[PDB]
Amino acid sequence: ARIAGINIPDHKHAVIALTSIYGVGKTRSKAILAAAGIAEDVKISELSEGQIDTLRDEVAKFVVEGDLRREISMSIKRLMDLGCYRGLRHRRGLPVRGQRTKTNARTRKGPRKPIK
Amino acid sequence: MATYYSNDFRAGLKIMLDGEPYAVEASEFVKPGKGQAFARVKLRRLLTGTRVEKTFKSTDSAEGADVVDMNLTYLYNDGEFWHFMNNETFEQLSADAKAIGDNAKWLLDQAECIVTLWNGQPISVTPPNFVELEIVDTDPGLKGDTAGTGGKPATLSTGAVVKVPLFVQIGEVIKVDTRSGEYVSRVK
Amino acid sequence: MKKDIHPKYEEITASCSCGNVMKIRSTVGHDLNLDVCSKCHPFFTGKQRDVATGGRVDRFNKRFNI
Amino acid sequence: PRRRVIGQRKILPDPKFGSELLAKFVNILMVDGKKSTAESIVYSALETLAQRSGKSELEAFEVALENVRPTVEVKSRRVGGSTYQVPVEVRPVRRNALAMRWIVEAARKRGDKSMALRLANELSDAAENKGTAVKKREDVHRMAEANKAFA
RNA sequence: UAGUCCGGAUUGGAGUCUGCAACUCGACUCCAUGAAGUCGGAAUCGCUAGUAAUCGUGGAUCAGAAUGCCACGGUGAAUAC
RNA sequence: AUGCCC
RNA sequence: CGGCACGUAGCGCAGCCUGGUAGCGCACCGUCAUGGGGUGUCGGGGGUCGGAGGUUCAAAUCCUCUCGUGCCGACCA
Ligand SMILES: [Mg+2]
Ligand SMILES: [Mg+2]
Ligand SMILES: [Mg+2]
Ligand SMILES: [Mg+2]
Ligand SMILES: [Mg+2]
Ligand SMILES: [Mg+2]
Ligand SMILES: [Mg+2]
Ligand SMILES: [Mg+2]
Ligand SMILES: [Mg+2]
């Protein structure tokens, strides 16, 4: 109920529980439970502490929140500092993968801002 | 127990003359040449709310009265008494039917209403600008052949009636302004 | 130290996954099942995987070359 | 509609009990043309209700209907400046149909876990004269007995 | 019964393919990320039966590039006083 | 019951 | 000259008494209704109080001095 620095819920199954980490989706958690030999239908309550330490070793074999956010922001900032096209798009808060902006950019532009 | 002179009171003050409370809405002091100066005051009879005008000679006027107005949160009307609780003195301040003049229809509950009480008895109630009420009796909004503005009368939870557009049905809380008595919104 | 006013402060043994037990006074009441302590925290052998610089030209001429 | 009155189509009865009105019911419950899932849901709810009620699911269903089934309802007319509420009788097929519709709508609104359980609760409460369904029936009778003066 | 094992937007990294050439500006895949959204105001649209609703499949155009368009079936209603 | 003008 | 009564959103007014929230109508913006305009319906945004200095924990409010305005009479010889 504590892994890689974050607290993991107890009432839910092990795969979903492990997904509660930043850097572990469903397939990643399936891989974790496989490598550790822990089933998927087991909830975090009713595990050996040792089992939990094994999970800790596996997730350590992966990359999670601290280093992950570090490298994400580092790449983003490398873009924004080069000033390449993706960089400028990040800077101005517009879609980067090439979507249209004549409408439907609400995720990158937040809510709409009326004229004043 | 303070007596006020005519050339003393400017707007706002509350007077007690003739055993009826008054309140100066406006007063212009005149000091003619070769005459005794005086003041044309516009009084507000704090009992019926009807204005009366007086010219008071520089000589004398009258004592002030216990006319105090402050927010009191409406509690409940049981029978004929409209209770309140000061937010800060928490007093079971009670008025009566005369004191509530046709503001009842605008009064619901938990409503902070500025009231004027004279010598520990409220003589008047001012309902808040807007009040959220719920319609309880309204025929449907059947558009039919209307080619124009129209509207719809609607009985409210306090007995009050007001015109509402067409779509509000029953169970809708409509914001109505106590001053005019008219619809403002549907309270979503 | 007043008498009644403070919570109970007793000796508690705390066991880590580094395999060491930390006997210490504390207020948790019960014992302690600890996961990561000072001597096992990746603070000495983590300052390179934690910084993760890398190099674009190296990655490139790895992916392909002349 | 306007030109020529027209006959109603035939519906085949349900498998389990073979009752036309029960087959109508599955239909009303049905959504997206998922007749199979609708049948499953109504059958499970009927089982639950039969167990809670003792007597067989048919008389259970029917007493629920006997409680929710209205007899008079109102239709607006807009005579002049004011709109009206004309109280008109309900023909038997109509009362059956909208009784079922009110029941299933109550169920859909209810806040239980699964639809079978919602429907079970609704049919039970209707049989015992409770719930939003019979509340709606009461409101409709009440609007009619308010606007009785019209005919 | 949770903003969730709902929702998939956005974004990072790594690739496949067509194509002289995917930066502006393709589609697609894997890992991670997990917004808004809890049924939508006034207002408004389609539908009378194999219809509405719902689910998939194909074609044209075309190297690549469809939630569009044109077709095909599967299940399959309510109601019309 | 309301319904003005191009 | 004083007394006096003001100065608050684009305009008209509240609030100030009794310091701790600046509101109310019109206007303004975006839909909707309409063949189109208007009426109408549904949504929204707007100033933070003429200016300066003090009382205070805190000033649109209480003080004081200014400035722009209104009304007042400035008489008996
Ligand atoms: Mg994924
Ligand atoms: Mg595109
Ligand atoms: Mg009842
Ligand atoms: Mg109901
Ligand atoms: Mg949300
Ligand atoms: Mg939900
Ligand atoms: Mg037809
Ligand atoms: Mg399709
Ligand atoms: Mg004209």
Question: Using a CB-CB distance cutoff of 8 angstroms, which residues of chain C are in contact with residue A70?
Answer: 50, 52
Q: How far is CA B89 from the centre of its chain?
A: 22
CA distance B3 to B27: 17
Shortest-distance nucleotide from B147 CA to C1':
F3
CA distance A40 to A33: 7
- This entry's atomic model was obtained through cryo-EM
Helices (H), B48-145: none
**Residue B145: both structure tokens together:** 């052949």
Q: SS3 of C55, please?
A: coil
Q: State which protein residues have CB closer than 7 Å to strand F.
A: B 144-150; D 78, 80-81
Measured distance between the N- and C-terminal CA atoms of chain C, rounded to whole angstroms: 78
CA-based nearest residue to B117, from B50, B62, B71 = B71
CA distance B15 to B65: 5
Question: CA-nearest residue of chain C to A61?
Answer: C49
CA distance A116 to A100: 24
CA distance A1 to B110: 48
Residue with tokens 């989706």: A25
Say if residues B169 and B140 touch (Cβ distance below 8 Å).
Answer: yes
- The one-letter amino acid code at B111 reads A
Question: What is the number of other CB atoms lying within 10 angstroms of the CB of residue B22?
Answer: 23
Question: Using a CB-CB distance cutoff of 8 angstroms, which residues of chain C are in contact with residue A2?
Answer: 35
**Residue B183: both structure tokens together:** 């619809």
Q: Are residues A56 and C33, on separate chains, in Cβ contact within 8 Å?
A: no
CA-based nearest residue to B84, from B116, B60, B52 = B116
- The one-letter amino acid code at D130 reads K
Q: Are residues C52 and A67, on separate chains, in Cβ contact within 8 Å?
A: yes
Query: Containing H/E element for D62?
Result: helix D57-68
Instruction: Find the domain containing C23 and state its range.
Output: 1-41
Say if residues B42 and B26 touch (Cβ distance below 8 Å).
Answer: yes
- Phi/psi of residue D57, each to 5°? -60, -30
* Distance in Å, residue B31 CA to nucleotide G67 C1': 28
Say if residues D74 and D85 touch (Cβ distance below 8 Å).
Answer: yes
Q: Is D31 exposed, middle or buried (0-12, 13-18, 19+ CB in 10 A)?
A: exposed
CA-based nearest residue to D47, from D17, D73, D12 = D17
B144 near D CB under 8 A: yes
CA distance C9 to D135: 62
Question: Residue A61 to residues A2, A56, A58: CA-CA distances in angstroms?
Answer: 16, 9, 5
Say if residues C20 and C41 touch (Cβ distance below 8 Å).
Answer: no
Residues in chain A, how many? Answer: 116
String of b and e for A65-78 (b: at least 16 CB within 10 Å)?
Answer: eebeeeeeeeeeee
CA distance B113 to B95: 12
Question: What is the number of other CB atoms lying within 10 angstroms of the CB of residue B31?
Answer: 11
Question: Residue B143 to residues A41, B97, C15, D81, D129: CA-CA distances in angstroms?
Answer: 59, 40, 77, 10, 36
> Within 13 Å and on the Cβ side, how many CA atoms surround B132?
10
Say if residues A32 and A24 touch (Cβ distance below 8 Å).
Answer: yes
- Phi/psi of residue B7, each to 5°? -80, 15
Closest-CA distance, A23 to chain C, in angstroms, reads 15
CA-based nearest residue to D86, from D72, D75, D101 = D75
* Distance in Å, residue B182 CA to nucleotide G36 C1': 31
> Within 13 Å and on the Cβ side, how many CA atoms surround D95?
19
Residue with tokens 């709409």: A112
Say if residues B151 and B165 touch (Cβ distance below 8 Å).
Answer: yes
Say if residues B164 and B126 touch (Cβ distance below 8 Å).
Answer: no
Say if residues B90 and B66 touch (Cβ distance below 8 Å).
Answer: no
Say if residues C22 and C34 touch (Cβ distance below 8 Å).
Answer: yes
Say whether C37 counts as a known binding-site residue. no
Q: Is B133 exposed, middle or buried (0-12, 13-18, 19+ CB in 10 A)?
A: buried
The resolution in Å comes to: 3.2
Q: SS3 of B132, please?
A: strand
Tell which phi-psi region holds residue C19, choosing left (phi > 0), alpha (psi between -120 and 50) or beta: left
Fold held by A2-65:
Helicase, Ruva Protein; domain 3 (1.10.8)
CA-based nearest residue to D72, from D145, D136, D133, D149 = D145
Question: What is the number of other CB atoms lying within 10 angstroms of the CB of residue A59?
Answer: 20
Say if residues B90 and B74 touch (Cβ distance below 8 Å).
Answer: no
- Phi/psi of residue D41, each to 5°? -65, -50
For CA atoms B9, B11, B15, B18, give the dihedral sign. Answer: positive
Spell out the domains of chain D, with CATH numbers in brackets.
20-147 (1.10.455.10)
Largest CA distance in chain C: 81
Query: Containing H/E element for B63?
Result: strand B62-63
List the beta bridge partners of residue B177. Answer: B130, B182
**Residue B26: both structure tokens together:** 């406006």
CA distance D44 to D109: 19
CA distance A29 to A6: 15
Question: What is the number of other CB atoms lying within 10 angstroms of the CB of residue B142?
Answer: 17
Question: What is the number of other CB atoms lying within 10 angstroms of the CB of residue B163?
Answer: 13
Comparing CB atoms, the residue among B139, B143, B144 nearest residue D85 is B139
For CA atoms B83, B86, B91, B93, give the dihedral sign. Answer: negative
CA distance D24 to D91: 17
CA distance C47 to C53: 11
Distance D32 CA to ligand 8 centre (A): 14
Residues 6 or more apart in contact with residue C19 via CB below 8 angstroms = none
